[model samples]
Target: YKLICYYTSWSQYREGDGSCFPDAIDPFLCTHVIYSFANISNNEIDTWEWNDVTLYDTLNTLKNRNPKLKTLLSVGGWNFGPERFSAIASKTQSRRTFIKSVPPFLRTHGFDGLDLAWLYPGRRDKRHLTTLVKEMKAEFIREAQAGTEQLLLSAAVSAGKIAIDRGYDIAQISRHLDFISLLTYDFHGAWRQTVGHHSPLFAGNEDASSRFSNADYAVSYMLRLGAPANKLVMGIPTFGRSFTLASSKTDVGAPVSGPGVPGRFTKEKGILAYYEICDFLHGATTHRFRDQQVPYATKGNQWVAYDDQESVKNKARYLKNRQLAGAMVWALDLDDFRGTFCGQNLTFPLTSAVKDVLAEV
Candidate 1:
């Protein structure tokens, strides 16, 4: 069977009252689970009272319940930002320390492997991503083969030219990874001004200049460059992107060029899941953008564009045609309770759709 995994953030996860992980979404669909490192700053790691219990303890409980699952630790994130990656990744001592520390950390918490989610690998980082990955892979292999059992090595990467242009030799990096997940979502977001498609195909002769943000170009470009198709995993989002409204019926597809809707923290702003949005669609309000083939509901003037199975199917097929590894959602928590999007439940349920279509492509 094809392998599927979910990227879960440790901190926010606890806040959901564990609603983030619904029991309905069984491990049968996704075999791997990557828990993003709970500690971002040096401070957060150094001074949280219940840090270990909140993070590792939670993962251990989940693992005990799901015997089929393999969890990995994700070290970096976008906001943690890339301050000293090159320096840290390049040095043998630093890398070795990371490798050594990771094993015990996992063993202590029942983790299965380690996943690196460095946003801009070689570019902003001190050392070349290729070198870092090559060495890290060797470390992972050496440790696992020696006796760590079967620890997996994976990475969450950006689907863009900068990921490549930043300078890691992707083909070489590909060899080190058991599988590379391509972040295909976030194609369009509130960051832009005018509405545009987040994940559009064909560009459809729409001003060429006014095409889907950059995800389309990036995903394809990564494959064209060096990322192996099957080794590539496409990403999906459970949340929606917000944008400011022009008129109650303004065109609502893709991310606009500059500042459409502002981004807000879900916990603070009370952002709802896409499935929740759908459930509330009728009474709440919605705006559709035929051009982008996606929809957004409006409340007063705020607009948010997000995915449905139609969009999910299109993107999933895109993965199949490209012969990519598989599809993974940003989370397993966002799907409606009764499978509103994929018709089954347990979150956005795209994993089954991909499997039914391409049976381990």
Candidate 2:
């Protein structure tokens, strides 16, 4: 199984006082680590000149300590959006330009490959996506034939059925990819009016809202759509989505008007890092939905939906049983990186549980 972890560049500047730089990484824990975000500007791939220059070198050096770890540069996260990718992927000339630029850039930065985190393809760019992947694979093959080192190709994909149907030619995309990391969480968030699990393993009887909204259903739907299970990595979030209730009630379906109070360390409204959530739930009431195979917590109408050790174990077992490639963390830094912030627990307890379950298989 491939244990992939994402390391965000901005995490170095996160509100938490703890260090989460490239040096803080324990390379042995993961088989691969993807650096979150390089930008797509003027139809070319680039990085923030200020940070990436030094950070890239620092990140790759971890391979010296543990040669087994492979690192990749992920480009075009949600913030990068659609315009640049659409422009680059739409035409042969532009696609050629983008494709030709990648290998040298990766070699220059000491990365093993690239992760296309374009968030998604829209209605019009769906075909263009397949074209882009095909072109890149062709280029990769050409280089390999010439006796150059082979590079990996991967993408982070949408789990929603609407997005899947509209944005992907599943079988075609699957053929070119080394792996596909599914964004299986975020099914429900502060964006919704009611409270719900952000990443439930199964849909309870009350979960008739949408067939594609839960992790289990999304994985199954992708398989039915011809996505190879061995190449699919289910996403596991190391944080929680929070909501402020409209009434005093604290039920799964209770009305929510806005985001809950921000975390002290993460200091982000509408979300809380798993470490921050640990602190929030210290004296709060925790609940488990047996049917859903998930857990949540509530206090004074401030509700939080998240995956704990048990839920992560459940997700791991599901992935193993389904014969999937493995699990990927949305980020490595979001978990209680320091261990002390979330009350002196072991570092990466959530991830530890995930590794433990994967080891069982």
Candidate 3:
């Protein structure tokens, strides 16, 4: 029943319909809201944004409104890179220094826990990662016994098989983490020469790689790798990957020359926030791939692989049927939380879609 929503700090800086503040969050919408992201400054956890402290103060106060809500601070991300984590996780003294800083920092900021979004660990990083988790778990136990609630420990991990095997001692990490948030999206994007849905519920194409793009394969692969079902948190996205076609052919494996034009709001090439996708769907030709069970849209030279409430509902039901821990949205900010953009008149439509399905299950 853990509907973990990740709120991006930078979204507050976006303009108008793109802007998202902590106030936009429905306090009861998620069991836990993870504030992303904190960074490593000189081998210790530090806030990444200028106004994060102010923003954190506002977000933590939501606990007053909903006493059951849990909050965690995420450290590290894709852009943060692996070198900094490699620096700390590999050395004994550095690991101790980094580990000692977490509890107090989380406690000082009124966060209930800490989540590691390391992007990934490398080949050598897998062994070092095991050490890091063991040491951190030990520290957490000692701190909890001394007094205070046991701070939750978790990690955001890869959805791909190669990365999973390369970066994790799957069973070891699984046993230690309170839960693992599987990044079950972004399997394909404009980064590739082929245009494909970034996230699909089932495999639509005949190719072997196509399986990675779907929710079913990622979850089953995780289970096959020995991750405990109750501790696995499947991810659903609030954004879609888009691309410009090399020609008029716009099927699953259509040739792609480059990314689609940036959205008016998100302004990011190759991707669209859920609200921006709402605009794309306004007059665009759309498809619900029968086998894939996810939505795809196209207009002229532009094509987008996105999820609507319908696709999210199916994903939610899939997670429920699998008996996984719950669902985690890659972000709260990217969703059409304002409601005005998507004409759904519901704040957090995609997120709410997940909650409703979980409720029924």
Candidate 4:
């Protein structure tokens, strides 16, 4: 099993404890660590930021301390949008230009692979997406045969059936990828309808329309659609989804008028870092849904659904029981990485929970 950790570039700007630079990464903490996010410029693969060239080197050096670790360069993210992805891979020449630039960029920087984190592809973009994937796979293989380490290829994919269907023709793409990172979190976020868990293992008391909004359904659906079991890495967010309760009711499906207040660290209204969640839970009443295998807490007009070490361990156990590849966390930055925020003094508690559970005999 693998513990894939994603590191965001912007974490460096968070000031104080909220900021996590490449130096803060614990090399041994994860089997594979991905540095996000590179960009596609002038129809060629490019680094996203001015300092990314240096940052990539700083991150790739984690392998020097722990040679067992695999480092990957990620391109595309939520903020990057699909316009650039569409621009680079929409046609044969365009895809060729991007494909031609892949290996050198990866090899030059010492990364072992590339992760295409295209938010997703619609029906119209699906074919070109597959074309790009196939071409990249061939290019990687050819480069390997030409006497280089076989570079790994992976994608961060959508978790829902509708999104999955629109974003990929999986059977075609699966064989080409080393692993598919399933974005299992964000199932519930910033919605006015109600407050709910972001990464619940099972769907609890949901109507037919909302039945597929949990990890269980997402994994099973991916497996059903030609994603080989072990090649699917399930993703969990290191942050929680927050909401402002519309009324006194604070149940999972209770009404939420808007997002909860922004965290002092993350400074995002609809989100809370694990460290912020620790502070929130100190005065809030927390409850666990055994069926759902996730926890939620409430305080005043605020409600939150997040995974702690216990819930995270449960998710890893689920991954093991299903014979899947492993667990992937949204970020190392949002976690309690310093071991100072939570009362337990657990550094990277959320990520540690996954690696520990998955690594156990």
Candidate 5:
């Protein structure tokens, strides 16, 4: 149930052009960092391309500076899935290859474990999932047996129903992973247009049956499907979703027609990280309830939807009530250095509040 941060690569934080590691970030607030897939090692000239050697040094320095920090190597993301995943899983020899190669990669990079983030493993849809997960788990156990230290293992899963249904056999997958990350954002946007809570506890009409991708349902669904509550982790968003709404395009505060807004990676759009947004003093609007928490903001004609401190605290309570393992953020870079969800200033509210909630743990 540790709070894990998302660091895509060494380049994302302190560009090599600068003094190596940026002094602005502190590792105490983060217990874990899911580094981008180590599977890719593009040419060094690409600049941003990850070089495990360089990353190892950076992490080593950080660890030496703060010995409590734990690091995990993330594999597979929204982009490419190593062709070797299935092949390696299907055969004992190839699986052995992976068991050997993976550790070297981790040891060389100074990482503690691995987080599998395969977007989708083909919809073989369901029939083969049991065997697929079993094979992978057997391989993982084999590798674990070979290692001197215990290596933690986890998986990132899609919140959407299609993925939940066709992806993996919940019971089998649960036994294999230490925890499973459920992406709870991106519930509504471009595809729907009209206002929809990215994460909500109740339906628009306040009906319990009304469906939304909020914390309660996402986590509860996994538990119902046979995943242990102690191994279920909820995913939170650092960025907000924005759409244009007139005085009466929909219900109160419900946005009407507009394109989806991407988070702070690109120069365009409201790409600023949560910390930057707080620094800019961007004003936002929010809604709160006992069972569920939500928030949003409006900048000129653009409407931004995001979470706040109250919402985060409430979400943490919900996780506790359900006995969830812990919460996972989309990326570490999104949080204000302080973890504040407020529009401006570093608050560090997300992790701080989560810690408070977890103190009883």
Candidate 6:
């Protein structure tokens, strides 16, 4: 199994011990470590900060410690938006320019490949999307034939059925890329009127909102749509989604007014890292486990849905059973990186669970 992890560039700016730098990573725990973003502007790709170049060099040098580990530069995160990617993918010249730049830039910075993190594709971009992948693959092939090292290509994809149908041509997508990372979490969040599991392994019998949105359903649907199971990596969230309930009495469909209060370290509203969630659960009330696959905690009207060690174990087992490409954590830094915040006081506890479960694979 391939354990792929995302390393966000901006995580260095996070507060206190929460900040994660490239030198702190345990490279052996991951087969591939993707640096979380570079931006696209005027049909060109560039780093968000000058320091990103320094970080890239530092990250690649970790191979000295774990020679088998590979690194990738991921481009186009949620903040980059769809318009730029759409523009880049639309024209043959634009696509060629983008593809032509990637290999040299990655080679210069000591990266093994590139991961396209374009959040979503527009409805009309279905064919153009495949064209982009096809062109990139051709470039990679040319490099290999010219006696240069082969480069890997991948994309992070939407798990929702509507987005899948509108954005991807699954068969073509699978054929061109090395693998696809499914954004399997966020099945439901504070944006919705009701509360539901952020990332459930199985939809409960009475959970109407999760009828077709859980991990099992999404993975199966992708396979049915012609995606190869072994080429699909299941994404696990290192953060929790929070919501405020309207009343004390609640069920899965209970009403929510808005997002829960932000975390001290992350300072992001309606979201908390696993580290923050663990600390909150320590003093919070009404802890509950549901779906036999997800866990939660509540404090006053603020309720948080997140994964713990047990939930991660279950998801890892699911990945093993389904014969998938192994688990991909959204970002390694969001977990209890320092081992101080979680109740158990263990380092990389969430991902550690996954590593142990898929150890034999």
Highest-TM-score candidate = 3
TM-score per prediction, in order, is 0.79, 0.96, 0.98, 0.97, 0.80, 0.96
lDDT by residue for model 4 (1-361), tens: 9889999988888878888888888888999999999888777778877889888889888888999999999989998878778867787898898899989999999999999999878778898889988999999999998787899999999897789878699998999999999999988777547777778889877443688889999999999999899799999889999888899997657888988899988898889999989988988999998778899999999989888899898889998999999989989999998879898877888899888888896
Which stretches of model 2 miss by more than 4 angstroms? 16-19
Off by over 4 Å in 1: 1-3, 7-25, 38-67, 122-127, 210-216, 252-265, 268-272, 284-293, 337-361
Tell me the number of clashing residue pairs for each predicted model.
23, 0, 0, 0, 13, 0
lDDT score of model 6?
0.86
lDDT of every model, 2 decimals: 0.58, 0.86, 0.89, 0.88, 0.61, 0.86
Please state every model's RMSD to the true fold in angstroms: 4.3, 1.4, 1.1, 1.3, 4.5, 1.4
1-361 in candidate 5: lDDT tens per residue? Answer: 5676666564354422221232334667667767765563231101235465676567556777778887777776766553535554555554445555665566656778778776666565344445545554565567667656666777888776656876678877889787788887767655664665676543444534446356566666778889998888887776566566644433344656665354333233534455544533345433444444576555555565666566666677777778788877766555554334454454455556665776665
lDDT of 3 by residue, 62-143 (tens): 9999999999999988888888898889899999999999998998899999999987888989998988888888888889
Candidate 6 lDDT over 189-226, as tens digits, reads 77778777778878777746447788898899999999
Tell me how far the alpha carbon of residue 175 in candidate 2 is from the true structure, in angstroms, after superposition.
0.4
lDDT of 2 at 230: 93
When 5 and 6 are scored with lDDT, the better candidate is: 6
TM-score, candidate 6, is 0.96
Q: Would you list the clashing residue pairs of candidate 6?
A: none
Global local distance difference test of model 3: 0.89
Q: Per-residue lDDT for 279-354 in model 1, tens only?
A: 4455547554454455566565555556666666666676677666777776665544346533354444554554
